[PDB]
PDB file of C-alpha atoms in Angstrom:
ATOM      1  CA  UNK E   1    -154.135  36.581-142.437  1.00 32.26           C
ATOM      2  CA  UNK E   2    -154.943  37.829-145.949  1.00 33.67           C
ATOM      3  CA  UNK E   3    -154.898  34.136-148.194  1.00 35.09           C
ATOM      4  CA  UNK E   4    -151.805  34.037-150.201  1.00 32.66           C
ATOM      5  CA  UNK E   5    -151.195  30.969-151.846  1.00 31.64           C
ATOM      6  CA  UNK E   6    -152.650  31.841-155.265  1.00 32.89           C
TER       7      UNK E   6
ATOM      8  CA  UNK D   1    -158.335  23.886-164.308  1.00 32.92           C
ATOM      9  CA  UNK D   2    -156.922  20.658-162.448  1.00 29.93           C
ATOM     10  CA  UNK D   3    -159.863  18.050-162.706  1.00 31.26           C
ATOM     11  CA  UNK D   4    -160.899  15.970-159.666  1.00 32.45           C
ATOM     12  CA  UNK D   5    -161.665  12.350-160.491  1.00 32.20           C
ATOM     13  CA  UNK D   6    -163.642  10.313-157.799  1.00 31.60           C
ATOM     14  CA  UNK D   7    -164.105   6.954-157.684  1.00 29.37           C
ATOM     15  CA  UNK D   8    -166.703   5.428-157.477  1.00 31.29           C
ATOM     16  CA  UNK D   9    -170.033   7.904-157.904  1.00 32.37           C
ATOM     17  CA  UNK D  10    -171.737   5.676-154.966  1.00 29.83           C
ATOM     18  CA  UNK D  11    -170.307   3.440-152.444  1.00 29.88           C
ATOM     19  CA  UNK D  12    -173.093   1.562-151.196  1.00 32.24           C
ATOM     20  CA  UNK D  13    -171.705  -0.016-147.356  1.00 28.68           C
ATOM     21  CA  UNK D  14    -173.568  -2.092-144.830  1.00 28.26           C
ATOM     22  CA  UNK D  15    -172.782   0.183-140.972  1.00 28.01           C
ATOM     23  CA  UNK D  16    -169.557  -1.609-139.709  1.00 28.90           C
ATOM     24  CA  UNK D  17    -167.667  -2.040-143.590  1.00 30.78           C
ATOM     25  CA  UNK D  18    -164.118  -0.500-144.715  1.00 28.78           C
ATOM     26  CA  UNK D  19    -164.671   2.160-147.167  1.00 28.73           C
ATOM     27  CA  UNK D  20    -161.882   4.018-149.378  1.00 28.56           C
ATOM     28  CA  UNK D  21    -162.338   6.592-152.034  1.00 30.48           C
ATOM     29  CA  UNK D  22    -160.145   7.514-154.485  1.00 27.16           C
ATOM     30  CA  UNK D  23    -159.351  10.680-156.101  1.00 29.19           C
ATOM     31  CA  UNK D  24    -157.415  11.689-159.183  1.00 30.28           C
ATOM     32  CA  UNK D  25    -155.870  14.754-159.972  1.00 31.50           C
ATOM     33  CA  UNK D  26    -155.283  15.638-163.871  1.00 32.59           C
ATOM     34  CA  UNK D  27    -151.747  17.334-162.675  1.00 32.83           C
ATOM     35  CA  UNK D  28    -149.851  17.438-159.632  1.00 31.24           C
ATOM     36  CA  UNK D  29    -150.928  19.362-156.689  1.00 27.61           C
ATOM     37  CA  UNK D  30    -147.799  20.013-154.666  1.00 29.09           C
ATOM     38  CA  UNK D  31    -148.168  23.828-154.299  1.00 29.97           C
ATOM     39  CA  UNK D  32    -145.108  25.742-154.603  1.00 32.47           C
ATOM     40  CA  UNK D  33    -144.509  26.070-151.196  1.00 32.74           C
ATOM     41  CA  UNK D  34    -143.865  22.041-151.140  1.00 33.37           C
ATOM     42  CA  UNK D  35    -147.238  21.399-149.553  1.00 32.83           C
ATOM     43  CA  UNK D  36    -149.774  19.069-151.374  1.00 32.75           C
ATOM     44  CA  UNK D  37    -153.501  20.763-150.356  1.00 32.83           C
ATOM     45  CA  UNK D  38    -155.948  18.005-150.772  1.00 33.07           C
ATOM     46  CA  UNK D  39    -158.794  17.917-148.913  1.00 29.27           C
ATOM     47  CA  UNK D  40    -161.962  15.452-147.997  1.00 29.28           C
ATOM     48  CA  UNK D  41    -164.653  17.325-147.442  1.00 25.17           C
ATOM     49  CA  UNK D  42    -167.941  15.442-145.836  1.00 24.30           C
ATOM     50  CA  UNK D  43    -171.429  16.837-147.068  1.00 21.81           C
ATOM     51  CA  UNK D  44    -174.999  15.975-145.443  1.00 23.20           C
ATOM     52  CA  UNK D  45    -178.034  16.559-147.187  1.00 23.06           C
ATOM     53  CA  UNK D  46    -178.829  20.237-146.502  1.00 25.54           C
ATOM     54  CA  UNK D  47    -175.963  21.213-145.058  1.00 27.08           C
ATOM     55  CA  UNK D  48    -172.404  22.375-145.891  1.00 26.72           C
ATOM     56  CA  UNK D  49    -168.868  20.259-146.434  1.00 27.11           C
ATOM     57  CA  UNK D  50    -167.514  19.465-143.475  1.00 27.45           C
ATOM     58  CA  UNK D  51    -163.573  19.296-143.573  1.00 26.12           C
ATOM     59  CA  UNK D  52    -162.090  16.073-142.803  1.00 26.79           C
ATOM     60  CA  UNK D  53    -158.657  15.399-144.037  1.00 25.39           C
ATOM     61  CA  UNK D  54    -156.384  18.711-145.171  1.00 23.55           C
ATOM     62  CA  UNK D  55    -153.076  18.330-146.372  1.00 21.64           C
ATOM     63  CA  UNK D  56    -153.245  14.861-147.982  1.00 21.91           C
ATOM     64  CA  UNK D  57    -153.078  12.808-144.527  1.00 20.03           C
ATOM     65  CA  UNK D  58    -153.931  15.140-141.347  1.00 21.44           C
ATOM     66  CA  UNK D  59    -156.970  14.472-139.704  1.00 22.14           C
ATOM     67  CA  UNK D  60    -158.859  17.656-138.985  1.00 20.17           C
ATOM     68  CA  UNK D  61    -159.950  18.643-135.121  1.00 15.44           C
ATOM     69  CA  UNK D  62    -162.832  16.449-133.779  1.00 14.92           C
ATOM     70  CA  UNK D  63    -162.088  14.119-137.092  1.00 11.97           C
ATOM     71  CA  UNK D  64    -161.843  10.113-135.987  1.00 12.78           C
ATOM     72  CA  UNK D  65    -159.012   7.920-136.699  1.00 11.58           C
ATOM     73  CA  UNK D  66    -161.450   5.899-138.689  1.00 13.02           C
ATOM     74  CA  UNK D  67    -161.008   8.501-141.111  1.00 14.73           C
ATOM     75  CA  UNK D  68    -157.489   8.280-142.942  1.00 11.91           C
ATOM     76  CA  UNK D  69    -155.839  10.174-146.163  1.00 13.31           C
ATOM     77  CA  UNK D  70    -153.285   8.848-148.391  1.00 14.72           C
ATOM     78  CA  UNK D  71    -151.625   9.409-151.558  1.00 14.42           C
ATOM     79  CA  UNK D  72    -149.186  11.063-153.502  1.00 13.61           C
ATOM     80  CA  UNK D  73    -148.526  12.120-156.909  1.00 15.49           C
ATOM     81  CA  UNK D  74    -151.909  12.193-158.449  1.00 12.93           C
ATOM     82  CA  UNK D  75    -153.765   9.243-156.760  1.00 11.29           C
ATOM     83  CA  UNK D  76    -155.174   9.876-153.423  1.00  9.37           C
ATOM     84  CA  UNK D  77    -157.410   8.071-151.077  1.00  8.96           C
ATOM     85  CA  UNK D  78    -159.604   8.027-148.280  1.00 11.37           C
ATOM     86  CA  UNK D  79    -160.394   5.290-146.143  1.00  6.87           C
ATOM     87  CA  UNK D  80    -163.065   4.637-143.699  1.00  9.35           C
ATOM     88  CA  UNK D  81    -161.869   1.854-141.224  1.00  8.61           C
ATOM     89  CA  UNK D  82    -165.934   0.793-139.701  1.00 10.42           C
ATOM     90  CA  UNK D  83    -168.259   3.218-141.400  1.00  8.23           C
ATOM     91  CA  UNK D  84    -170.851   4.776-138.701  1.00  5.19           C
ATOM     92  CA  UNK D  85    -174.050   5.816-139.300  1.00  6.40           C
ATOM     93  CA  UNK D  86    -172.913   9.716-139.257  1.00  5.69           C
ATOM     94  CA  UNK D  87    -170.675   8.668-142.044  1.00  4.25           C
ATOM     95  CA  UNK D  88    -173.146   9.300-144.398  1.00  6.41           C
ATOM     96  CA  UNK D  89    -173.284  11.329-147.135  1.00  2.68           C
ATOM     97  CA  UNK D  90    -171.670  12.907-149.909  1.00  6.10           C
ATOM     98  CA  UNK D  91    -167.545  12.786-149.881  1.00  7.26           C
ATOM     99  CA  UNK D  92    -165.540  15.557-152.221  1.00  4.61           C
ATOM    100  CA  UNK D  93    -161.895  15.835-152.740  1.00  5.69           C
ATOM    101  CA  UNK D  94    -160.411  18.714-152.959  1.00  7.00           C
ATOM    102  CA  UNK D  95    -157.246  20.639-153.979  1.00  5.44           C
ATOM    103  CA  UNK D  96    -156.182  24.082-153.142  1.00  4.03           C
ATOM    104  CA  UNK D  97    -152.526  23.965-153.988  1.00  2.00           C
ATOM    105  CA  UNK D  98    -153.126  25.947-157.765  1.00  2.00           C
ATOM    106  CA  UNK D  99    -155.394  27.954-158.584  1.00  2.00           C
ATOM    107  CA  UNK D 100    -158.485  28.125-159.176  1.00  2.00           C
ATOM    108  CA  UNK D 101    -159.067  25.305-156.487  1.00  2.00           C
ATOM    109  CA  UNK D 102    -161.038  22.536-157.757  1.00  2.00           C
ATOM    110  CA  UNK D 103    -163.046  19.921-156.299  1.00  2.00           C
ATOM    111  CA  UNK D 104    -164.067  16.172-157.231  1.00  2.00           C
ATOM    112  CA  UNK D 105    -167.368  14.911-158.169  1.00  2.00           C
ATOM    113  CA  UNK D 106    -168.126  13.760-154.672  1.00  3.28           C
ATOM    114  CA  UNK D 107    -168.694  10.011-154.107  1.00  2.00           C
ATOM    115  CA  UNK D 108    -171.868   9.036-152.004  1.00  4.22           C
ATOM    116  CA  UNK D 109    -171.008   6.847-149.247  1.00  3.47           C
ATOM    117  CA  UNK D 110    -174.620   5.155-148.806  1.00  4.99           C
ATOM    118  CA  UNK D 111    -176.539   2.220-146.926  1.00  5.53           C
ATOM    119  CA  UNK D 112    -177.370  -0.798-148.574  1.00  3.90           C
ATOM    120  CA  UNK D 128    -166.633  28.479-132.247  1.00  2.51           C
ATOM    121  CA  UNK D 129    -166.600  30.839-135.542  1.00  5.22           C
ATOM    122  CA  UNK D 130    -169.483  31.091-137.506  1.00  2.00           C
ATOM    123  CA  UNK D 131    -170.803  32.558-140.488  1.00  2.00           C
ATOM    124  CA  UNK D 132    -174.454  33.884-141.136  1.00  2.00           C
ATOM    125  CA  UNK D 133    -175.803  33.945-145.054  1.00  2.00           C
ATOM    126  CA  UNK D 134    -179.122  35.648-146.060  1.00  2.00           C
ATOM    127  CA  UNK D 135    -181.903  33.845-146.494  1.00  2.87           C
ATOM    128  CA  UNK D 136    -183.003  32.200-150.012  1.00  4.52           C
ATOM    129  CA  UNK D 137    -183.669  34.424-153.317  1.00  4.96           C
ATOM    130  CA  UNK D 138    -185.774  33.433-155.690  1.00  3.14           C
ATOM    131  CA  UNK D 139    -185.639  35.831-158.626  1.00  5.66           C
ATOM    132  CA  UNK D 140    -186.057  36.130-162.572  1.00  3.66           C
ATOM    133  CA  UNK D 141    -183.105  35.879-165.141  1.00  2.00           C
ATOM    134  CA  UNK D 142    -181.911  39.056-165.440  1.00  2.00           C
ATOM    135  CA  UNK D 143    -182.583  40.339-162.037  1.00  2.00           C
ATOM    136  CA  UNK D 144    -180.124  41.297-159.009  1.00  2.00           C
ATOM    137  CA  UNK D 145    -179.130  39.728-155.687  1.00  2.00           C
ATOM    138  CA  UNK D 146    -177.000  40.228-153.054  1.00  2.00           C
ATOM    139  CA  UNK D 147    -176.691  37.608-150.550  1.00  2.00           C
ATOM    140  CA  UNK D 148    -174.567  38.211-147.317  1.00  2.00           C
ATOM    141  CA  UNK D 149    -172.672  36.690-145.351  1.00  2.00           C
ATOM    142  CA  UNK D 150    -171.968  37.824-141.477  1.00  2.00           C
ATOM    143  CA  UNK D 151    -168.459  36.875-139.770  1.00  2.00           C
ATOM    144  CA  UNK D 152    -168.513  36.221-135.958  1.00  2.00           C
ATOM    145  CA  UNK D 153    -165.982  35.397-133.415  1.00  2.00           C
ATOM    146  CA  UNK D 154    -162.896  36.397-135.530  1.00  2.00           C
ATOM    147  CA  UNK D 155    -161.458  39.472-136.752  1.00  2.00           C
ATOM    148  CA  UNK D 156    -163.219  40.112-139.588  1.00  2.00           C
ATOM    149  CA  UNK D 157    -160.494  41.493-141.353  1.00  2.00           C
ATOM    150  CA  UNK D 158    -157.729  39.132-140.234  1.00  2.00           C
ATOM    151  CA  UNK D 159    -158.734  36.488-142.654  1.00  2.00           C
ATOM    152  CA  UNK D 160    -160.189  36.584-146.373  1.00  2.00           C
ATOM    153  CA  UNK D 161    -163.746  35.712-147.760  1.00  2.00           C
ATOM    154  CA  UNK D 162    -164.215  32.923-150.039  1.00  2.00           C
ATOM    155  CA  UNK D 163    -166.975  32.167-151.994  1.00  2.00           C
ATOM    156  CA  UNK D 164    -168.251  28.741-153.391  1.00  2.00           C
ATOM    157  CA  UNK D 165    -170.768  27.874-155.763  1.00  2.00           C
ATOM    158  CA  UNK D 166    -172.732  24.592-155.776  1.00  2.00           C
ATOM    159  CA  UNK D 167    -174.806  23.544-158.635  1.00  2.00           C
ATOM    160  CA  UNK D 168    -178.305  22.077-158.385  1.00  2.00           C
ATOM    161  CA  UNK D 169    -176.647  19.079-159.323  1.00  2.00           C
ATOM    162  CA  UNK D 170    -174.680  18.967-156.366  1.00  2.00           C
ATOM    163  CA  UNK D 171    -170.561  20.272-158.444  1.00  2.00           C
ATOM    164  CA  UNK D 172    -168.674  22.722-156.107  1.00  2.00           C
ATOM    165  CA  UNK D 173    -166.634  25.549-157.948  1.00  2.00           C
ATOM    166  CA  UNK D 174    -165.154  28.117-156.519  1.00  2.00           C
ATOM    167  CA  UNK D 175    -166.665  32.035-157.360  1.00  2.00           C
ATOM    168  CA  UNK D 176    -163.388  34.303-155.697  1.00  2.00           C
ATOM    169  CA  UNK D 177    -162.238  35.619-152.456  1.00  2.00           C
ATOM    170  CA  UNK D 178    -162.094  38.910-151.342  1.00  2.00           C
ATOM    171  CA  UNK D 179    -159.437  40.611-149.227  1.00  2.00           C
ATOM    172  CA  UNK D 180    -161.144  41.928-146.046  1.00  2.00           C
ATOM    173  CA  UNK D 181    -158.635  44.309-145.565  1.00  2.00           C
ATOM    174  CA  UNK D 182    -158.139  45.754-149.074  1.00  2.00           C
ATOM    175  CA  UNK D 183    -161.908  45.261-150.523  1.00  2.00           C
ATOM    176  CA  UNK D 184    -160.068  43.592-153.183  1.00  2.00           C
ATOM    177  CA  UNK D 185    -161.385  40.459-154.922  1.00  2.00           C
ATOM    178  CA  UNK D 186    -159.697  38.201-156.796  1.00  2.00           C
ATOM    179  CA  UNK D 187    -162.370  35.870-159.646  1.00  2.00           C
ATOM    180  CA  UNK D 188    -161.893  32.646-161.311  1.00  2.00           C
ATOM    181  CA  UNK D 189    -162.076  32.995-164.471  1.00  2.00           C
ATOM    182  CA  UNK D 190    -165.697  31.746-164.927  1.00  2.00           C
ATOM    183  CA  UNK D 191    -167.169  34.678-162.165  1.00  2.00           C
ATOM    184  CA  UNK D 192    -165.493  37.264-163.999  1.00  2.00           C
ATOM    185  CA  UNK D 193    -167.946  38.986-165.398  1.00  2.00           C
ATOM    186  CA  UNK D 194    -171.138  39.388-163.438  1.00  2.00           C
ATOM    187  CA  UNK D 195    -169.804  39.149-159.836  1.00  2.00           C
ATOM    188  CA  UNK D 196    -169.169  41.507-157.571  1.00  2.00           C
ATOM    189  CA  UNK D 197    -167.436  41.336-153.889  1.00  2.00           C
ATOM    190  CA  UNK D 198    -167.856  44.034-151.288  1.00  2.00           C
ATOM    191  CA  UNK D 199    -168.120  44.121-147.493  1.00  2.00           C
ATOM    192  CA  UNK D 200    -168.987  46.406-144.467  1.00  2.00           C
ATOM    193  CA  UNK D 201    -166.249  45.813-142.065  1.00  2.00           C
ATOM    194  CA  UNK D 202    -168.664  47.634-139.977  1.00  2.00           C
ATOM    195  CA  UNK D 203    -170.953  44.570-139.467  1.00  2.00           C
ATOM    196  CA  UNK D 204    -168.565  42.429-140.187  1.00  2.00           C
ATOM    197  CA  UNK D 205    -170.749  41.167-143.146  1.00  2.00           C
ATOM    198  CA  UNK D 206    -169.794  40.275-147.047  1.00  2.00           C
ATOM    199  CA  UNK D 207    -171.439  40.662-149.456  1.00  2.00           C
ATOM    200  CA  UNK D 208    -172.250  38.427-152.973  1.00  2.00           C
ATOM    201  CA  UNK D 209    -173.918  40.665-155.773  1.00  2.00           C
ATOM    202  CA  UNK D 210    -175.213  38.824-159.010  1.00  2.00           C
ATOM    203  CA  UNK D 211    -176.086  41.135-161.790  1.00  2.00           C
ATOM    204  CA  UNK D 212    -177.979  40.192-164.831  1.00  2.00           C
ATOM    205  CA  UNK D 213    -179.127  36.523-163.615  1.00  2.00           C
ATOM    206  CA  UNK D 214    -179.367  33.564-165.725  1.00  2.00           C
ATOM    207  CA  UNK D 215    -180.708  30.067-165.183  1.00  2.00           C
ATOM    208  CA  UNK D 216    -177.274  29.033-164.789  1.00  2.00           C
ATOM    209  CA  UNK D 217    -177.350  31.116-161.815  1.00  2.00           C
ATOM    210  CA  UNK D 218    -179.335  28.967-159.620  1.00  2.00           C
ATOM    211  CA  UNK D 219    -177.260  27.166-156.979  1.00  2.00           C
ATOM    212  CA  UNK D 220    -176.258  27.543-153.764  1.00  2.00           C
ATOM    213  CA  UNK D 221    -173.554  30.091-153.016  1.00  2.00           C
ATOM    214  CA  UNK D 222    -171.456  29.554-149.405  1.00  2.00           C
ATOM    215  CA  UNK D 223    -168.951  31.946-148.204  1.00  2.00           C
ATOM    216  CA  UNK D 224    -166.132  30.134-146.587  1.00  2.00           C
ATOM    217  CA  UNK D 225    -163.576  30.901-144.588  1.00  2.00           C
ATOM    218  CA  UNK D 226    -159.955  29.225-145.073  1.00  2.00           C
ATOM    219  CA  UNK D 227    -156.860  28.669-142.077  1.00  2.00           C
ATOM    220  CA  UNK D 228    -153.864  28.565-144.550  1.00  2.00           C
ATOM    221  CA  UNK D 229    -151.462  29.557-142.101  1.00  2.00           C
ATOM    222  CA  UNK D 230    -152.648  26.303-140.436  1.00  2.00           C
ATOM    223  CA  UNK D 231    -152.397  24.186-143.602  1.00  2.00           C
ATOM    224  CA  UNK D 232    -155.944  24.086-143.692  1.00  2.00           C
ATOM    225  CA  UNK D 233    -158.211  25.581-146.598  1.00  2.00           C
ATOM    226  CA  UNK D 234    -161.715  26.466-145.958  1.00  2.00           C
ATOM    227  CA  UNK D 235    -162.360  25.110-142.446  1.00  2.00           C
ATOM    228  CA  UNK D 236    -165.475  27.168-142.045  1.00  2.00           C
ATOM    229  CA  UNK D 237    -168.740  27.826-144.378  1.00  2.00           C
ATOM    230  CA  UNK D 238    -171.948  29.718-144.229  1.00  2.00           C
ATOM    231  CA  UNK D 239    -175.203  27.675-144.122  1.00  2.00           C
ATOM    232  CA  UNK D 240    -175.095  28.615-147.914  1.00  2.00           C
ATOM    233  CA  UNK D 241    -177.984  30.738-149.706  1.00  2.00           C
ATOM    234  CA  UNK D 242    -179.922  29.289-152.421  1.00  2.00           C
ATOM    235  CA  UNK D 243    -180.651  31.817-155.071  1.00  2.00           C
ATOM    236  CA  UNK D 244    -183.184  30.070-157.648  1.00  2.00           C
ATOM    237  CA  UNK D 245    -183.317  32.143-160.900  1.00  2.00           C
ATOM    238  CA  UNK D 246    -186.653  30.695-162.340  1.00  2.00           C
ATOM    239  CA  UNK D 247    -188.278  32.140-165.681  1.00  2.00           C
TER     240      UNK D 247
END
């Protein structure tokens, strides 16, 4: 899963 | 951004003693999803942070109950019930909930199946180019993203960017801007790390890490690290 988040 | 205050610099403990480490954040860190991302990372001389506590109080896999988080609001601490021997070495807070994520000083604690493969160590002269790598094994490469973590001769941790392995998109903090450049070969599963136009300031140790979000953890896995030492 590609980081989101920021 | 959001400073990291640890306290003390060294915590000097006979093997058996309670130990606790506090932290201070110069804003809140709830992220906006209404989790609060700090972290204790454990560092020995060497090697990389290990993560210990994520998510203010949760113990991460393998982790003793000797080790405990606490906290809220801007004060946080860590405390060792009986420091062991293995205890040892450097502690650094750690928040991921805004960006750029930040970590603390790091407070020496002292006496009185995934894995990532870096390059080996660069030593070049200011104004030169490198391009240290970074090989992903036993995960989808392009599941997850690519971090990348910079850690001063001094021993400061600051995060460089991430990378999207499945757009070849990176994302900078504001102070890698400039002369950094992400890339990857999903091929070998490897990313890559380019410095252009080094500078003294250059030298440190750069670790890609990989992060478990979805899991409330960030950056649960790091390279060995490559040094690159920019000497005149």
């Amino acid at each position: 899963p590609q980081i989101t988040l920021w | 951004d959001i400073l990291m205050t640890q306290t003390p610099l060294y915590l000097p403990v006979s093997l058996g003693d309670q130990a606790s480490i506090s932290c201070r954040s110069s804003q809140t860190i709830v992220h906006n999803n209404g989790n609060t991302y700090l972290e204790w990372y454990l560092q020995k001389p060497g090697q990389s942070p290990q993560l210990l506590i994520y998510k203010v109080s949760n113990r991460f896999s393998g982790v003793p109950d000797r080790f405990s988080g606490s906290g809220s609001g801007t004060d946080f601490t860590l405390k060792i019930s009986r420091v062991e021997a293995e205890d040892l070495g450097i502690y650094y807070c750690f928040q991921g909930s805004h960006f750029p994520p930040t970590f603390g000083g790091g407070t020496k604690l002292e006496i009185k199946e995934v894995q990532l493969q870096q390059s080996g160590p660069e030593l070049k002269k200011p104004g030169e180019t490198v391009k240290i790598s970074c090989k992903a094994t036993n995960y989808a490469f392009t599941d997850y993203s690519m971090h990348w973590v910079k850690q001063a001769p001094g021993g400061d941790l600051k995060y460089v960017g991430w990378i999207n392995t499945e757009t070849d998109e990176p994302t900078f903090a504001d102070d890698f801007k400039g002369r950094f450049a992400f890339s990857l070969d999903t091929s070998t599963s490897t990313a890559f790390l380019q410095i252009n136009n080094l500078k003294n300031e250059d030298t440190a140790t750069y670790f890609c890490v990989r992060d478990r979000h979805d899991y409330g953890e960030i950056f649960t896995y790091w390279g060995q690290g490559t040094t690159v030492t920019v000497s005149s």
